[PDB]
Amino acid sequence: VHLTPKEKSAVTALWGKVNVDEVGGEALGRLLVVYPWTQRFFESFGDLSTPDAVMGNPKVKAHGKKVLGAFSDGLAHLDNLKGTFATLSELHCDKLHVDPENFRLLGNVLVCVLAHHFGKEFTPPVQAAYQKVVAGVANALAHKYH
């Protein structure tokens, strides 16, 4: 995906302020709460009975951290997302068989979490830049379906 320099600047500047220990878990937790069918893939994580249970679940926070790392990895290779996400694509598509619509959903939940954390700093043009990024990541993760 192609970001303008202005968009790259906006994205990179905000990402440096991201709490990398928490934001991934917040996004994954919210995915599980807002789109409850996604819990089908996480039965080994234990207590997912309530929103509080999900958000406070240590396994959700831990896994969320791994997801955010992958997004961070993608932000460093915007011109080669396919190669960057090749192994993850094989995992999520060939092994897990996650419908790729859910890649889009998690990306949009991440955008909601960024808006929550940054408030007025998450301006409409900053959002538009991040929508390009999460769309790129979703498409790259879905490559094994293509």
Partner 1 sequence: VLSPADKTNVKAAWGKVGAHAGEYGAEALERMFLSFPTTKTYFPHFDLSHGSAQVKGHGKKVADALTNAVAHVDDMPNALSALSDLHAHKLRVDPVNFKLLSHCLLVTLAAHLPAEFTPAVHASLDKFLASVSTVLTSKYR
- Find the largest Cα–Cα distance for the chain: 44
Q: Which residues bind a second copy (CB under 8 A)?
A: 1, 135-136, 139, 146
Name the residue nearer to a second copy (CB basis): 3 or 23: 3
In the complex with partner 1, the residue whose CB is nearer, 6 or 80, is 6
CA distances from 67 to 4, 27, 129 (A): 25, 9, 19
| 120 vs 146, beta carbon nearer a second copy | 146
**Nearest approach, Cβ of 122 to partner 1 (angstroms)?**
5
Q: How many CA atoms lie within 13 A of 99 on its CB side?
A: 7
The reply, when asked if residue 1 is annotated as ligand binding, is yes
Which of a second copy, partner 1, ligand HEM, none lies near 29, with the C-beta cut-off 5 to 8 A by kind? partner 1
For 99, list phi and psi in degrees, rounded to 5.
Answer: -65, 135
CA distance 55 to 89: 26
Q: Which residues bind to ligand HEM, rule: CB under 6 A?
A: 38, 41-42, 66-67, 70-71, 88, 92, 96, 98, 102-103, 106-107, 137-138, 141
| CA 131/CA 23 separation, integer angstroms | 17
Beta carbon of residue 139, minimum distance to a second copy (angstroms, whole number)? 6
Query: What is d(CA 38, CA 48) in angstroms, rounded to the nearest whole number?
Result: 11
Q: Tokens representing 63?
A: 């896994």
Q: Which is nearer to partner 1, 37 or 87 (CB)?
A: 37
Binding residues: 1-2, 63, 82, 92, 143
